[PDB]
Paper text:
Pseudomonas aeruginosa can also secrete a mART toxin, known as exotoxin A (PE), but with an organization of its three functional domains (receptor, translocation, and enzymatic elements) that is opposite to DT. All these PLTs were composed of a single-chain amino acids that folded into three distinct structures: a receptor binding domain I, a translocation domain II, and a catalytic toxin domain III. Cytotoxicity associated with this family of toxins is due to their enzymatic activity and the ADP-ribosylation of eEF2. Our analysis of four of these new members by X-ray crystallography presents the defining three-domain structure typical of this family, despite substantial variability in the amino acid sequences of these proteins.
Primary sequence alignment of PLT proteins indicates that K57 is conserved in Spx but not in the others. However, superposition of the crystal structures shows the presence of a comparatively positioned and positively charged lysine or arginine residue on the same β-strand (β4) in Cfx, Hmx, and Jlx. Chx266hGH, Abx259hGH, and Sfx257hGH, were the most efficient in transporting hGH across SMI-100 monolayers, while PE259hGH, Chx266hGH, Abx259hGH, Cfx259hGH, and Sfx264hGH were superior to the other PLTs for transporting hGH across AIR-100 monolayers. We superposed the newly identified PLTs with PE and observed extremely high conservation and positioning of residues within the catalytic cleft, indicating that the NAD+ cofactor can be accommodated within this pocket. Remarkably, loops 1 and 2 of all PLTs superpose well with PE, whilst loop 3, which is conserved at the amino acid sequence level, presented more flexibility in our substrate-free structures and may regulate access of the catalytic site to diphthamide. Although we were not able to produce active toxins due to safety concerns, our structural analysis shows that elements involved in NAD+ binding and ADP transferase are conserved in all PLT family members, supporting their putative ADP-ribosylation activity. Only PLT genes in Aeromonas hydrophila, Chromobacterium haemolyticum, Collimonas fungivorans, and Shewanella putrefaciens matched the core gene GC content.
Residue numbers in the entry: 0 to 31, 40 to 284, 287 to 619
The structure:
Amino acid sequence: GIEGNFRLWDDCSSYCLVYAAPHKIYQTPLATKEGVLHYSMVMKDYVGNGQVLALRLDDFATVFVEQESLRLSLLGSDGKPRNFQYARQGAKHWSLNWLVPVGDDAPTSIKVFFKNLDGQNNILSISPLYSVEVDDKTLARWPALATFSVTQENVTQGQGLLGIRRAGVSYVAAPVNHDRHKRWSEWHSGKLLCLLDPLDAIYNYVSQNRCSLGETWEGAIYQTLAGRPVDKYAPPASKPVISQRIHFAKGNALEALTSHRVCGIPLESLARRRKPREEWSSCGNPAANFVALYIATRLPFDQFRQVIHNLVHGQAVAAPDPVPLDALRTAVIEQPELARQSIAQAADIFRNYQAANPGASAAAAQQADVLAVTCPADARPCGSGASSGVLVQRENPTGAHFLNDGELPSFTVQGTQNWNLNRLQAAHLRLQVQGYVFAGYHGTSLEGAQSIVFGGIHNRQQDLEEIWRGLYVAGDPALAYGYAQDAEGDERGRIRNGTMLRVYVPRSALPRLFATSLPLDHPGASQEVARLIGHPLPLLYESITGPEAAGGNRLATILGWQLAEQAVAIPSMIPTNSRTVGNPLDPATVTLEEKQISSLPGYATKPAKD
Ligand SMILES: [Ca+2]
């Protein structure tokens, strides 16, 4: 047993029992290019007399062990204290983990998570990966100078005990080359677990979408450095919610998450770099800037579609102070579509925040944490019972995850770049193998495409009857092509060419892809479509395919947003053209090769069983 200082790797590699005393801090060393360290140990504590144990993680955190909760208490470079609580729910065992990045240009946040366990080392649940931004002094301190320590905060009768098993630290190397933007792109997502042999089982179990997708260092070697850490954990009984809780010191959470959605930038990439290295000139900074500027005018976020339009066309606006409004006007006129994309996303994020936090100000939203929930990519709604004080980011897959290692596509007025007919077929294979089917063509603006393909298909406000809300697609490219452009003209009235996208939905949704012969503008559409799906509109986890409004010689598919948010989109090879904007689709331009992969799903014409 340990009644003083110790050596964790030596003493607790298999088992050691700490006789926690108040008034005594039992300390240990933690000594052992680019990569991740995963410190791990399995705990069984005894705090039966209401003892509270305090485990100092070097200089950056403190874990408090109470009988019914594991509490983490953080200290970044901000100085201010941030506290969290994880419920044990009667569990007597638990794992303590934390992930430290090492490198010259590695991330500047450490992660800390607990797992509740049964007697037999089976996962019962997992905590959020609590992320904590730390200074360069703190980052330099690993792996060689860092220490761990155990103590009891309170004086009680009885004897506080902490039995540690299977203490260890494992390294995993960053991949060779890999553009830094991409290399660490999963540091702030659930997929971080995929870098970790013990836990790679869990993420794959939850999503099913596999760790195959993303920069998850497939070829990496999860290697031990010291002690004897647990090597593998079994998939739990029920599916756990994998989630990362991320903080923003600058109080720019809405700006950041908006950038993330609009531009498809890793939340990690929008955080302190060790080596500053503006390469976010094209999308990142503008989008964030729009949110800041919009906030400064105090305009309701729901009115934004109107507002942006007015500022584009020199129509008045209800702002008392003209200076912030003008700052916005200027930025809006320079990039009216990107302004429209940016504040659309921000609007959705903020609407959700208020649903979890009634009467909360944008200013408050800006200082909230982001809770990146990797959804159980199957059932229905992941984000559930928000911890109040978080912006909930639901992580489903994105088109970009299915693209080759080649130079990533981009959406110019000349057209889609680095996108040939080979990459589409190869990317179509992956989507098939991964259990998706083509649902239809989608036409969007250039900036709309970067949003959808890289940031993912996220719900946006729309000037649509609340009932008919959803992502619109179409079997016939002609119908989608109508919308492959800026939604409206700038101050000169110019409408740029856009981009043609291919939306794919998951195969497992096929029973829920309904079809009617009745026009969607027909009065009795709402009732008939409701009869087909089992509830009144709007559309949840189901699609609807029917005749477009008017005579309309084509079929329009509306994906419900819940389905849409699980849907994925890649670039079509059907080009738009800068000279012909406003014309119909010239069918010469649609290749046969792409036509052959665009067979449509077998729609259902009868309500599901009851
Ligand atoms: Ca692995």
